[PDB]
Amino acid sequence: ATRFRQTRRRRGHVSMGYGRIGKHRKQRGGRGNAGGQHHRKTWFTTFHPDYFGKHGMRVFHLKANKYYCPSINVDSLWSLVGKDVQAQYKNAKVGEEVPVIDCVKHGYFKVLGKGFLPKQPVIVRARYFSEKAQQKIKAVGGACELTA
């Protein structure tokens, strides 16, 4: 909305809101990220202190598909099936049917351990597990499978 800008409220003012001593000239210190170490150094020092230099080894053709490992914590495991299913099997133990929360179907590969789990047995089928994730699943009375 051009009618809502400051140009329409600065009609009549000579400098159009830019000052009389310091005019609105073409450049205010260069074109782009100029002077990264000379006159805009204090800007880069203040707001991007690690902009200049090198760090870490070069990976000539990085395979970002090999680093794709979505993770879900234990506290969010039962939300994969539902709250009604959770209450349906809330009184199961060893010997009877226990629902299997396979996480690869939901797009989660590694299961992490954070938060708390409901006091029910469960079978967690996932590609990778954490050391503290397996403890919480087994301490509640469940099992940790593996896939692929």
Binding site: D102, R125, E145, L146, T147, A148
Partner: protein, 89 residues
Amino acid sequence: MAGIAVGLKRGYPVHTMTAKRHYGVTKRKHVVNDVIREACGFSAYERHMMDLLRRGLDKKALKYAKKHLGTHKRGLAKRDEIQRALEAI
């Protein structure tokens, strides 16, 4: 139940199904190789290889072969054909 994702034995359990075809020559290419060889002979650099091999300098032949062929593996394959020709006279 459903393998494992790490190690040498990694992946979903499945029966993988690939022929390793060998691209090679027939038994008549042996004759064609000889017939052309008599009609042509050896290259200028091939002949200098024969002189080096005669005097028992096998390492200096490979270095000379590498210089004119640009491959260590292709240098051996020439140092064998040349040394085979010496035993054929």
